Symmetry: C2
Subunit: 136 residues, 2 copies
């Protein structure tokens, strides 16, 4: 029953509006309105195509928040390298095991400057090396 | 290296402010200044302590933005279910494989009302079944 579908979208549309990352209330409101009307008009095909604008990865809307999530993860990783480096200097030649993990992180970051997240493992090894020094 | 450490954090702090997901907090500005101040005074231990507020998963700041990424994904998954339902109904009709999948997704979503992402596999099976019908 098509009338049952409209109620489902109406509530999903309500949850969409509450999620601030998904849109700035510009295209998102017009996408929902057109989809609501297409469903009310019985144009399931266009309604399905219309909502695709909000779920497809190619659409600009997914790129906006995906970049936002990337910037946040990258900044956190950059902070942890400084944090682990700070903890290291607080302790004050050191084991080659610890410093080899440090050179690897910088060597990796230089290799992947555009997408630093490719060095997440190298950063983890560096953090664990600093952790170990604290214990012995 | 403590001097070089101060310069790096100054660079990262500016990137923190640009990231609206991480820099929207009114508290984050006070953490960066205090973390920056600690570096100038040479209190590396305290500086790393302040930095944990921006990296720890427990801290409110990380809890704030992770919830946003999670609900964008939840609403996105909810839209795909309606989209697959619309296309299924677009095809006037169904194979048991189609019925098995739609009932699994609807059952799962109510059972995991708090965390709908636990149904991502069930949603894919439902989407793949709708694709199978469209192609034959």
């Amino acid at each position: 029953t098509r009338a049952e579908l409209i109620d489902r979208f109406r509530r999903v549309a309500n949850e969409v509006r509450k999620a601030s990352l998904l849109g700035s209330g510009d295209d998102v409101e017009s996408i929902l309105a057109r989809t609501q009307a297409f469903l009310e008009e019985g144009d399931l095909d266009n309604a399905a195509r219309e909502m695709n604008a909000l779920t497809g990865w190619s659409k600009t809307l997914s790129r906006d928040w995906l970049a936002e999530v990337r910037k946040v993860l990258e900044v956190r990783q950059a902070l942890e390298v400084i944090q682990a480096e700070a903890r290291l200097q607080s302790l004050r030649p050191l084991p080659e095991s610890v410093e080899k993990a440090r050179s690897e992180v910088v060597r990796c970051l230089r290799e992947h400057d555009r997408r630093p997240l490719n060095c997440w493992q190298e950063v983890e090894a560096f953090k664990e090396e600093v952790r170990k020094l604290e214990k012995g």
